[PDB]
Amino acid sequence: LLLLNRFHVDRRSKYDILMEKLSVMLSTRTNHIETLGKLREELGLCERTFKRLYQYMLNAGLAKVVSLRLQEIHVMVRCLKLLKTVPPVDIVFERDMLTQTYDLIERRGTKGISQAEIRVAMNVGKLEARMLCRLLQRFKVVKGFMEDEGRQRTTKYISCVFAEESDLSRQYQREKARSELLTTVSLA
Amino acid sequence: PNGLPNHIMAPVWKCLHLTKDFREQKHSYWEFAEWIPLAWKWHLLSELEAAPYLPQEEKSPLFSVQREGLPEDGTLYRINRFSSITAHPERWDVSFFTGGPLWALDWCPVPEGAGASQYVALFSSPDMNETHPLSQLHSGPGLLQLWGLGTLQQ
């Protein structure tokens, strides 16, 4: 739901207000534990509704799944227990930014560095870090490798000193070769 | 007569007159008469006192100079810190060695027509391998060098 600020109102949810009611009940139980049936009966709830509340209270981390013996409440009885890196570069006078940027990538070596981590380490803007990487690619001093991590197909950059020996090269080259085999042994 | 087109040279010739007229208007022959050098403020350091300031390379890299249209000399030159090769007898270029990588340099100005001896002031960093972060003050020891080039008449 999108509300323009003038019209912003905190819309509740049926499960939320019932979870709060169950929390009020359980927190006022001296043990903070009650059986599901009583927790339903205290609110007249059907099991179909209540099992959402139970699992939402669990998923919210507000309560824990527990079972107590009937002689412990006074048979095992199901219950709810309520509970509630790269160092930056000191840019030097005597070297151009491409020399200084290649030195950073050399100090990374086999593990490489992304454009975003170059950007922070060099203390430059997004467009400026981008141009540095494009030039270092075309000068053939740095080799770029893709790495999927999280949601992002980030590029990582490695100097041609370490590029061939790098993990990203070795991993990619194996899966490339394996792919070219599998596709060529697939029938024409 | 130098072989460039006249329309390429014409701004060059024009700039001579414009510079001379500017200097006649807006340079001067004397200023800061209060600040004449006093010899008692110029203390000569002894050899063992000077040694911390001297730039650290004692001999230049080996080099050779090829000049277009001359025969190949083929010798490698090398020269001591604070020493110079002789000017080429026909083309008058000179190389000299300052003991470290040069990071400032200016000509001593002389009033036009003085025909004086010409000098340059320069700074060459102590160590070839040093490189200094801009974000931090340094305050180390160093040396300012004055080199005399002669009067440079033909």
GROMACS .gro file of C-alpha atoms in nm:
model
  342
    1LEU     CA    1   0.000   0.000   0.000
    2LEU     CA    2   0.131   0.344  -0.101
    3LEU     CA    3  -0.001   0.646   0.089
    4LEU     CA    4   0.094   1.005   0.018
    5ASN     CA    5   0.207   1.148   0.351
    6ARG     CA    6  -0.104   1.363   0.404
    7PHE     CA    7  -0.310   1.042   0.389
    8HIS     CA    8  -0.077   0.804   0.574
    9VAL     CA    9  -0.271   0.594   0.826
   10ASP     CA   10  -0.134   0.285   1.003
   11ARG     CA   11  -0.364   0.015   0.868
   12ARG     CA   12  -0.371  -0.280   1.107
   13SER     CA   13  -0.403  -0.647   1.011
   14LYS     CA   14  -0.636  -0.907   1.160
   15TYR     CA   15  -0.346  -1.139   1.246
   16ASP     CA   16  -0.143  -0.852   1.394
   17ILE     CA   17  -0.412  -0.738   1.639
   18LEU     CA   18  -0.486  -1.101   1.731
   19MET     CA   19  -0.114  -1.172   1.777
   20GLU     CA   20  -0.098  -0.870   2.009
   21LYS     CA   21  -0.403  -0.999   2.199
   22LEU     CA   22  -0.239  -1.341   2.231
   23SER     CA   23   0.081  -1.168   2.343
   24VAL     CA   24  -0.116  -0.972   2.604
   25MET     CA   25  -0.275  -1.299   2.720
   26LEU     CA   26   0.049  -1.501   2.728
   27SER     CA   27   0.246  -1.218   2.890
   28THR     CA   28  -0.023  -1.201   3.160
   29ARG     CA   29  -0.004  -1.576   3.212
   30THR     CA   30   0.248  -1.616   3.493
   31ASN     CA   31   0.432  -1.892   3.302
   32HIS     CA   32   0.404  -1.718   2.962
   33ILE     CA   33   0.274  -2.056   2.837
   34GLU     CA   34  -0.075  -2.170   2.745
   35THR     CA   35  -0.223  -2.453   2.540
   36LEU     CA   36  -0.351  -2.374   2.191
   37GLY     CA   37  -0.709  -2.474   2.274
   38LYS     CA   38  -0.735  -2.228   2.563
   39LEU     CA   39  -0.564  -1.962   2.350
   40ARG     CA   40  -0.833  -2.024   2.088
   41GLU     CA   41  -1.113  -2.035   2.347
   42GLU     CA   42  -0.997  -1.708   2.505
   43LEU     CA   43  -1.055  -1.551   2.160
   44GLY     CA   44  -1.323  -1.780   2.014
   45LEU     CA   45  -1.091  -1.851   1.722
   46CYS     CA   46  -1.113  -2.133   1.473
   47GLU     CA   47  -0.805  -2.350   1.430
   48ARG     CA   48  -0.769  -2.233   1.068
   49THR     CA   49  -0.718  -1.874   1.184
   50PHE     CA   50  -0.525  -1.961   1.501
   51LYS     CA   51  -0.262  -2.178   1.331
   52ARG     CA   52  -0.157  -1.872   1.130
   53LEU     CA   53  -0.130  -1.670   1.453
   54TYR     CA   54   0.070  -1.948   1.618
   55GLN     CA   55   0.313  -1.979   1.326
   56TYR     CA   56   0.333  -1.601   1.278
   57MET     CA   57   0.408  -1.557   1.649
   58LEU     CA   58   0.678  -1.822   1.604
   59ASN     CA   59   0.811  -1.667   1.282
   60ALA     CA   60   0.810  -1.323   1.444
   61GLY     CA   61   1.034  -1.472   1.714
   62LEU     CA   62   0.780  -1.366   1.978
   63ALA     CA   63   0.713  -1.722   2.099
   64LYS     CA   64   0.847  -2.078   2.102
   65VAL     CA   65   0.692  -2.417   2.027
   66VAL     CA   66   0.668  -2.604   2.359
   67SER     CA   67   0.469  -2.896   2.498
   68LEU     CA   68   0.387  -2.955   2.865
   69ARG     CA   69   0.249  -3.257   3.045
   70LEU     CA   70  -0.107  -3.231   3.176
   71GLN     CA   71   0.031  -3.287   3.527
   72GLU     CA   72   0.263  -2.992   3.459
   73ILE     CA   73  -0.022  -2.765   3.350
   74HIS     CA   74  -0.223  -2.870   3.657
   75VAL     CA   75  -0.066  -3.681   2.860
   76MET     CA   76   0.152  -3.437   2.663
   77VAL     CA   77  -0.021  -3.111   2.575
   78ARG     CA   78   0.087  -2.880   2.293
   79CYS     CA   79   0.148  -2.524   2.410
   80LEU     CA   80   0.283  -2.186   2.306
   81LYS     CA   81   0.566  -2.035   2.512
   82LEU     CA   82   0.591  -1.658   2.474
   83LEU     CA   83   0.947  -1.527   2.446
   84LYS     CA   84   0.867  -1.158   2.392
   85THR     CA   85   3.738  -0.469   0.350
   86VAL     CA   86   4.013  -0.342   0.119
   87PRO     CA   87   4.211  -0.058   0.281
   88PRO     CA   88   4.170   0.276   0.102
   89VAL     CA   89   4.450   0.413  -0.113
   90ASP     CA   90   4.630   0.725   0.008
   91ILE     CA   91   4.662   0.886  -0.334
   92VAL     CA   92   5.024   0.982  -0.393
   93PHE     CA   93   5.158   1.288  -0.573
   94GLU     CA   94   5.414   1.126  -0.800
   95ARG     CA   95   5.197   0.874  -0.990
   96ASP     CA   96   4.903   0.904  -1.228
   97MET     CA   97   4.567   0.757  -1.130
   98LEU     CA   98   4.597   0.464  -1.372
   99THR     CA   99   4.933   0.365  -1.222
  100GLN     CA  100   4.787   0.400  -0.872
  101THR     CA  101   4.476   0.201  -0.970
  102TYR     CA  102   4.679  -0.084  -1.121
  103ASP     CA  103   4.885  -0.098  -0.800
  104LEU     CA  104   4.565  -0.146  -0.597
  105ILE     CA  105   4.456  -0.430  -0.826
  106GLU     CA  106   4.803  -0.584  -0.798
  107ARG     CA  107   4.787  -0.570  -0.419
  108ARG     CA  108   4.457  -0.760  -0.443
  109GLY     CA  109   4.601  -1.013  -0.689
  110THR     CA  110   4.449  -1.360  -0.709
  111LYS     CA  111   4.129  -1.260  -0.526
  112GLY     CA  112   4.055  -0.961  -0.751
  113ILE     CA  113   3.843  -0.655  -0.681
  114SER     CA  114   3.512  -0.520  -0.806
  115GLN     CA  115   3.449  -0.180  -0.963
  116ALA     CA  116   3.243  -0.085  -0.656
  117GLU     CA  117   3.529  -0.173  -0.421
  118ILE     CA  118   3.772   0.019  -0.643
  119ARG     CA  119   3.532   0.315  -0.621
  120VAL     CA  120   3.539   0.316  -0.241
  121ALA     CA  121   3.911   0.239  -0.212
  122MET     CA  122   4.006   0.514  -0.458
  123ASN     CA  123   3.750   0.762  -0.317
  124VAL     CA  124   3.609   0.853  -0.660
  125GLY     CA  125   3.263   0.884  -0.811
  126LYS     CA  126   3.069   0.610  -0.987
  127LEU     CA  127   3.137   0.745  -1.338
  128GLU     CA  128   3.504   0.801  -1.254
  129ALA     CA  129   3.563   0.447  -1.123
  130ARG     CA  130   3.385   0.314  -1.434
  131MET     CA  131   3.620   0.499  -1.670
  132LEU     CA  132   3.928   0.378  -1.480
  133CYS     CA  133   3.820   0.015  -1.525
  134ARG     CA  134   3.736   0.060  -1.895
  135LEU     CA  135   4.083   0.204  -1.962
  136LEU     CA  136   4.266  -0.062  -1.761
  137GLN     CA  137   4.076  -0.324  -1.960
  138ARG     CA  138   4.168  -0.175  -2.298
  139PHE     CA  139   4.531  -0.127  -2.194
  140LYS     CA  140   4.520  -0.508  -2.135
  141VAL     CA  141   4.677  -0.467  -1.790
  142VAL     CA  142   4.362  -0.594  -1.611
  143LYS     CA  143   4.129  -0.881  -1.701
  144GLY     CA  144   3.762  -0.878  -1.600
  145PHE     CA  145   3.565  -1.177  -1.474
  146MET     CA  146   3.197  -1.198  -1.389
  147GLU     CA  147   3.089  -1.329  -1.051
  148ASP     CA  148   2.729  -1.384  -0.949
  149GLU     CA  149   2.687  -1.299  -0.583
  150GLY     CA  150   2.367  -1.211  -0.406
  151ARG     CA  151   2.133  -1.059  -0.664
  152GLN     CA  152   2.415  -0.902  -0.869
  153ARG     CA  153   2.628  -1.022  -1.160
  154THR     CA  154   2.922  -0.818  -1.037
  155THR     CA  155   3.242  -0.796  -1.237
  156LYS     CA  156   3.569  -0.868  -1.061
  157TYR     CA  157   3.899  -0.742  -1.201
  158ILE     CA  158   4.239  -0.912  -1.180
  159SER     CA  159   4.576  -0.811  -1.321
  160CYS     CA  160   4.711  -1.017  -1.612
  161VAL     CA  161   4.997  -1.115  -1.379
  162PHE     CA  162   4.753  -1.317  -1.167
  163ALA     CA  163   4.457  -1.347  -1.405
  164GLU     CA  164   4.525  -1.692  -1.553
  165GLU     CA  165   4.611  -1.842  -1.212
  166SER     CA  166   4.309  -1.684  -1.041
  167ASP     CA  167   4.023  -1.883  -0.891
  168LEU     CA  168   3.769  -1.709  -1.117
  169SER     CA  169   3.970  -1.809  -1.425
  170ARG     CA  170   4.021  -2.168  -1.307
  171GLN     CA  171   3.656  -2.217  -1.208
  172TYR     CA  172   3.521  -2.059  -1.529
  173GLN     CA  173   3.766  -2.243  -1.757
  174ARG     CA  174   3.663  -2.582  -1.615
  175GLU     CA  175   3.289  -2.517  -1.657
  176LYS     CA  176   3.347  -2.375  -2.006
  177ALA     CA  177   3.532  -2.691  -2.115
  178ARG     CA  178   3.271  -2.915  -1.950
  179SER     CA  179   2.996  -2.719  -2.127
  180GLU     CA  180   3.162  -2.751  -2.470
  181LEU     CA  181   3.195  -3.127  -2.417
  182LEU     CA  182   2.833  -3.175  -2.306
  183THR     CA  183   2.690  -2.969  -2.594
  184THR     CA  184   2.904  -3.148  -2.855
  185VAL     CA  185   2.818  -3.493  -2.718
  186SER     CA  186   2.454  -3.387  -2.738
  187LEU     CA  187   2.325  -3.529  -3.065
  188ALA     CA  188   2.341  -3.312  -3.376
  189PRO     CA  189   6.240   3.062  -4.379
  190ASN     CA  190   6.225   2.797  -4.106
  191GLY     CA  191   5.995   2.594  -4.333
  192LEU     CA  192   5.668   2.642  -4.150
  193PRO     CA  193   5.383   2.816  -4.334
  194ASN     CA  194   5.370   3.191  -4.277
  195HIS     CA  195   5.018   3.164  -4.134
  196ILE     CA  196   5.152   2.919  -3.875
  197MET     CA  197   5.447   3.144  -3.788
  198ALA     CA  198   5.255   3.475  -3.797
  199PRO     CA  199   5.115   3.437  -3.441
  200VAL     CA  200   5.464   3.347  -3.314
  201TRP     CA  201   5.614   3.665  -3.459
  202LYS     CA  202   5.318   3.866  -3.328
  203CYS     CA  203   5.374   3.737  -2.973
  204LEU     CA  204   5.725   3.887  -2.955
  205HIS     CA  205   5.601   4.247  -2.980
  206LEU     CA  206   5.305   4.187  -2.748
  207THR     CA  207   5.530   4.039  -2.478
  208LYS     CA  208   5.788   4.320  -2.502
  209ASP     CA  209   5.521   4.591  -2.474
  210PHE     CA  210   5.357   4.412  -2.179
  211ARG     CA  211   5.686   4.391  -1.989
  212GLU     CA  212   5.768   4.756  -2.061
  213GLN     CA  213   5.430   4.844  -1.908
  214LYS     CA  214   5.399   4.599  -1.621
  215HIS     CA  215   5.732   4.451  -1.523
  216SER     CA  216   5.991   4.656  -1.334
  217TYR     CA  217   6.365   4.672  -1.277
  218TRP     CA  218   6.360   4.677  -0.896
  219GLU     CA  219   6.124   4.567  -0.619
  220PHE     CA  220   6.151   4.454  -0.256
  221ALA     CA  221   6.455   4.670  -0.186
  222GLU     CA  222   6.428   4.571   0.183
  223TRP     CA  223   6.511   4.203   0.118
  224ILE     CA  224   6.876   4.199   0.006
  225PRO     CA  225   7.070   3.880   0.095
  226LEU     CA  226   7.284   3.897   0.410
  227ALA     CA  227   7.588   3.667   0.419
  228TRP     CA  228   7.567   3.609   0.796
  229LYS     CA  229   7.232   3.436   0.737
  230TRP     CA  230   7.401   3.199   0.487
  231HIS     CA  231   7.575   2.941   0.706
  232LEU     CA  232   7.782   2.692   0.505
  233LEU     CA  233   7.724   2.335   0.622
  234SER     CA  234   8.032   2.115   0.640
  235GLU     CA  235   8.047   1.794   0.437
  236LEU     CA  236   7.933   1.581   0.730
  237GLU     CA  237   7.658   1.830   0.814
  238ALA     CA  238   7.536   1.841   0.453
  239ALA     CA  239   7.518   1.462   0.392
  240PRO     CA  240   7.163   1.415   0.532
  241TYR     CA  241   7.026   1.666   0.279
  242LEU     CA  242   7.200   1.544  -0.038
  243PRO     CA  243   6.983   1.338  -0.277
  244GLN     CA  244   7.077   0.976  -0.252
  245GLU     CA  245   7.171   0.856  -0.602
  246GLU     CA  246   7.541   0.920  -0.656
  247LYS     CA  247   7.551   0.846  -1.031
  248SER     CA  248   7.287   0.887  -1.302
  249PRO     CA  249   7.130   0.596  -1.486
  250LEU     CA  250   7.337   0.502  -1.787
  251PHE     CA  251   7.207   0.678  -2.097
  252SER     CA  252   7.289   0.763  -2.456
  253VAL     CA  253   7.169   1.051  -2.673
  254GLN     CA  254   7.088   1.013  -3.043
  255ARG     CA  255   7.053   1.332  -3.246
  256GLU     CA  256   6.857   1.333  -3.572
  257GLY     CA  257   7.083   1.348  -3.876
  258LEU     CA  258   7.405   1.291  -3.686
  259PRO     CA  259   7.590   0.958  -3.680
  260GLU     CA  260   7.515   0.725  -3.391
  261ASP     CA  261   7.754   0.803  -3.106
  262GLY     CA  262   7.693   0.464  -2.942
  263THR     CA  263   7.864   0.542  -2.612
  264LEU     CA  264   7.667   0.516  -2.291
  265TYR     CA  265   7.712   0.827  -2.079
  266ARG     CA  266   7.692   0.842  -1.703
  267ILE     CA  267   7.751   1.144  -1.480
  268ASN     CA  268   7.791   1.202  -1.108
  269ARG     CA  269   7.537   1.380  -0.892
  270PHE     CA  270   7.589   1.757  -0.927
  271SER     CA  271   7.778   1.709  -1.255
  272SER     CA  272   7.704   1.772  -1.622
  273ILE     CA  273   7.796   1.652  -1.968
  274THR     CA  274   7.947   1.907  -2.205
  275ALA     CA  275   7.710   2.081  -2.445
  276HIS     CA  276   7.691   1.924  -2.788
  277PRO     CA  277   7.922   2.142  -3.000
  278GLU     CA  278   7.661   2.210  -3.271
  279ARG     CA  279   7.319   2.166  -3.106
  280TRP     CA  280   7.420   2.286  -2.755
  281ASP     CA  281   7.189   2.052  -2.564
  282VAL     CA  282   7.308   1.967  -2.212
  283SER     CA  283   7.221   1.688  -1.970
  284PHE     CA  284   7.302   1.715  -1.600
  285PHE     CA  285   7.221   1.495  -1.301
  286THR     CA  286   7.056   1.615  -0.980
  287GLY     CA  287   7.062   1.293  -0.775
  288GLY     CA  288   6.689   1.219  -0.761
  289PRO     CA  289   6.357   1.256  -0.943
  290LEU     CA  290   6.288   1.620  -1.025
  291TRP     CA  291   5.958   1.756  -0.893
  292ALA     CA  292   5.999   2.133  -0.915
  293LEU     CA  293   6.186   2.354  -1.161
  294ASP     CA  294   6.191   2.721  -1.264
  295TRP     CA  295   6.415   2.963  -1.453
  296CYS     CA  296   6.566   3.258  -1.271
  297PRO     CA  297   6.416   3.569  -1.439
  298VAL     CA  298   6.656   3.832  -1.570
  299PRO     CA  299   6.551   4.175  -1.705
  300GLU     CA  300   6.548   4.175  -2.083
  301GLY     CA  301   6.871   4.300  -2.237
  302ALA     CA  302   7.080   4.225  -1.928
  303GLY     CA  303   7.265   3.946  -2.110
  304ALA     CA  304   7.320   3.791  -1.768
  305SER     CA  305   7.425   3.449  -1.653
  306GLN     CA  306   7.119   3.222  -1.657
  307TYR     CA  307   7.023   2.985  -1.375
  308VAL     CA  308   6.755   2.733  -1.286
  309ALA     CA  309   6.629   2.638  -0.942
  310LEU     CA  310   6.508   2.281  -0.900
  311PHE     CA  311   6.413   2.019  -0.643
  312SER     CA  312   6.489   1.650  -0.695
  313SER     CA  313   6.339   1.410  -0.443
  314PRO     CA  314   6.587   1.228  -0.216
  315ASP     CA  315   6.487   0.869  -0.302
  316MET     CA  316   6.383   0.736  -0.642
  317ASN     CA  317   6.140   0.498  -0.468
  318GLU     CA  318   5.967   0.742  -0.233
  319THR     CA  319   5.614   0.845  -0.314
  320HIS     CA  320   5.424   1.070  -0.077
  321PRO     CA  321   5.054   1.062   0.016
  322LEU     CA  322   4.884   1.396  -0.048
  323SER     CA  323   4.660   1.367   0.258
  324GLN     CA  324   4.954   1.385   0.503
  325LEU     CA  325   5.209   1.651   0.591
  326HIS     CA  326   5.568   1.536   0.541
  327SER     CA  327   5.824   1.785   0.683
  328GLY     CA  328   6.127   1.566   0.600
  329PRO     CA  329   6.473   1.698   0.511
  330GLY     CA  330   6.541   1.800   0.152
  331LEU     CA  331   6.755   2.022  -0.068
  332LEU     CA  332   6.683   2.309  -0.307
  333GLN     CA  333   6.938   2.321  -0.590
  334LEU     CA  334   7.051   2.623  -0.793
  335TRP     CA  335   7.220   2.533  -1.124
  336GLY     CA  336   7.402   2.786  -1.342
  337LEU     CA  337   7.360   2.752  -1.718
  338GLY     CA  338   7.590   3.034  -1.829
  339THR     CA  339   7.493   3.330  -2.046
  340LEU     CA  340   7.377   3.102  -2.333
  341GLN     CA  341   7.502   3.329  -2.609
  342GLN     CA  342   7.594   3.164  -2.940
   0.00000   0.00000   0.00000
